[model samples]
Target: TIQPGTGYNNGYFYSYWNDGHGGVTYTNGPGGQFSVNWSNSGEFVGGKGWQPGTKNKVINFSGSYNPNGNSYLSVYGWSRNPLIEYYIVENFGTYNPSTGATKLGEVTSDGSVYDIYRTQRVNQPSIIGTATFYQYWSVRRNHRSSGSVNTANHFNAWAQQGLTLGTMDYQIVAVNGYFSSGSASITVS
Candidate 1:
C-alpha cells in the first residue's frame, strides 16, 4: 500500500494484474499536480493516488492523456470490510470493454451523468485462495479530457441508492488496458 504525501517523480507503482500486466511512472510537479506515464494490455492498472480514509469529504482531480494505442483513465475509490469499488472512467485510444459487468443504470452526480454498474464476485479462487468482492462503477457516457470530481457527493448519492459502503480504502487515477502503448498524467488534490 502507498502512504499519504508520498512523492512520485517518474516513479512506478504496484502492478494491477496477476500476469504482470500493468506498470506506471510519475513526475511530481509544483503544487499538488503530478504527471504519470503508464502502459497495459486488457488489464486494470491501478495503485496511484491517495487514501485519505472514508468520510464525508470532498476530493478533486484533473488530468489528460496522450494515448498511442488503446487505454482508459479512471478516477476510482475502493472500500473494504464489505468491499465496494467506485469508478469514473475516461475512455481513450482503444476502449477496453468490460465483459459480464452489469450496467445498473444512469445516475447524475457532481454535475456528471454516469452509467452505473454492479458486479459481484463470489467464491472465486486466486493465487491467495478464495475471494469475493463487489464493484460499483459510475462510467461517464462521454469522455472527459480533464476535470474535478467530488467523491463525497458520489458516495452519498450511491449510499442513498442502497449500496452498502464501509470505509473508503483507497482512491486512484488509473490507466486500464493497452492495445499497443499509451500514457496518462493527473494533478490530484
Candidate 2:
C-alpha cells in the first residue's frame, strides 16, 4: 500500500493518494514513468510528471490502461492565480464528467475533438487551502490510451470562454479512481 505522498526522480514527479481504506500500490520508474493498481473505498490517484509543470509545453504519453470501473485518465494539474484545477481528460470509465457541466466550448486538439467544461467548487479544500475555485476540464470525445496533448490549444480555447489561468503547479499524466478499481503502466515524454 502506498501512502498519499509525493516523489521526484529524473525530472518526473510521482504521486499517490488513498482515502484511508488502503489497497493502492504504485511502482515508481525512471522519469515520468510508473505503474499503479488500486481497489479502495473513497479515492485513489497515482501518476507521474513534473511538479512545476510547464505552460506552453506539449505533453506526450502512453499507457497500458485498464480502468475496470469508475476511473479517469488525464493530464491533471493546478494553477495559482485563480486557484484553478484543470483536467485534460483523455479517457474515462462509466462517469463522464462533462455530462451535466456547463459546456464552455470545444477545441480540436492533438487530433481529437475535446469538449471544454467549467465547474465550480465552492468553499472546498483546494490547492490554496479552503477556498472557492473553478475546475476546467477538456473531455475528449474519442478516448485513447496514447496521444500527444497540445495543452496551449486547450488553454487558449478556455480563455476564449473567459476561463483564464494562472501559474501552473504539479501536473501529471494521472489516473484517478473513485470508489473503484483500475491500473496503468504509463510513460511520459
Candidate 3:
C-alpha cells in the first residue's frame, strides 16, 4: 500500500490524503498510473500526475471507477497566481458536484458535453495553505471513464464566462470521496 503521502513515482507525482476515520489503500503503479480504495465514509482523495502541471495539455486517461455514496472521479488540480481550484469532473456517484453551483454555461470537449460552473471558497484549505479562491468546474452531462480532456478547451470556455486560472500548481487524474467508499484504477498520459 502506498498509504497517505506524496511523492514522485516513475516520473509522475502521486498523493494519498485521508482525513477521517476510515481505512484506505493508495497504490502507485508504473508511469502515470495509480489506484485507490477506501472503506466506509471518510474524506479521502488520491491521484497521480504532474506536480507543477502544464499550462495546457491534452490529458488522455483511461480508468475503471466503482464508487458509492458521495464520490467524484475527476481531472482535478490547482493553480496559483490567481489561486484557483478546478475540476473537470468526468464521473460522480450519488452526489452531483453541481447541485448548488451556479451554471456559467456549457462546453463540449473530448466527445462529451459538460456544464460549466463557477464557485468561490472563503478562507478554505487550498494548495497554498488557507485562502479564498475561485473554483472552476466542468461537470459532464454523460459521465464516462475513458477519454482525452483537452485542457485548453475548458480554459478557453471558462475565460469566455469570465473565469480565470493561474499558473498550474498540480494536475492529476484523481478521485475524491466524502461520506463514501469505492475504488478506482487510473492511468494518464
Candidate 4:
C-alpha cells in the first residue's frame, strides 16, 4: 500500500511485494524492481531475473538514462514474451540520494503545473492488470505556447501517447513551453 506522494521521490518511489516470509521489500527503481538480493531456492514474486551476490540487479534490457546530464533520471524496463513493460521516469532534483528522500518538482507546461503519475490497477493478490501502467497527466490549466502547440514545442498525439496491448497508452509528451523565468520546455514523459 504505497500511496503516491505529493512531490517526486518523496520516499514514495518503491512499491511493496509479498515475500511469503510476511516481510516485503520495495524495489529501488520507481517501476518496482525489488531492492534486495534473494536466494534462488526461495520464491520471489517481483521483477524477473535474479542472480546471487549482486547488490543491485538490473535486467538485461533494464537501464537508466540521465538526460540533461544533471537532475532527471529515466529508468526503463522491457519484456518480450507478451511484449509489455513501462518506464518509471523520476526527477530526483530536491531529494537527497544519500540519507533522506527527495521530491521532484511538479511538471510545468505553458506556465501551468502538471502532476503526473503512473496509473496501475491491482488484480490478483500480486499481479497487476494488463496495460495497467500508463502515464497520467493532469494540469490546472490548458496548454498554450508561442510556438506550435501540438508539435514544435509539444509532442503530437502520435508522439505523446502510444498504443499498448491494443489500447491507447497515455504516455506524457514534452511541449515547447517554458516555465515562468525558465528557459526550457517542460517534459511530462
* Per-model lDDT: 0.58, 0.86, 0.87, 0.25
lDDT tens digits, residue span 1-189, model 2? 445788876777877776677666777787778887877546777788887887777999987888877889999999999799999999998799777899999999988899999999999977679999999999999999899998889988999899999999988899888887777888998
By TM-score, is 1 or 2 better? Answer: 2
Q: Write the per-residue lDDT of candidate 1 for residues 1-189, one digit (tens) a residue.
A: 222233343332222332244354445555445555655544435435665445564555676678766666776666766766667675556553444677666677666787767777687642235678776766776777567666665666667667677766666666555534666666655
> Between which residue pairs do clashes occur in model 2?
none
lDDT for model 4, on a 0 to 1 scale? 0.25
Model 3 per-residue lDDT tens digits across residues 23-70: 667899988888888778578888888888875788988979999788
How many angstroms is residue 13 displaced in model 3 relative to the true structure, after the best TM-score fit?
1.1
In terms of lDDT, which candidate is strongest? 3
Runs in model 2 lying further than 4 Å from the true structure: none
Better of 3 and 4 by TM-score: 3
Judging by TM-score against the true structure, name the best candidate.
3
Steric clash pairs (candidate 1): 10-26, 11-26, 40-178, 41-178, 70-94
**Ranking, TM-score, top scorer first:** 3, 2, 1, 4
| Model 2 quality (TM-score) | 0.94
How far in Å is the alpha carbon of 186 misplaced in model 3? 1.0
Model 1: residue 131 alpha-carbon error in angstroms: 1.6
Which residue window of length 10 is worst by lDDT in model 2?
A: 1-10
lDDT, candidate 4, 1-189, per-residue tens: 232111123222222233344322223334323232222212222222221112122212223321221222222233222333333333322221222212222444334443333344333221234443332222223323221111111112212433132222222211111111111222221
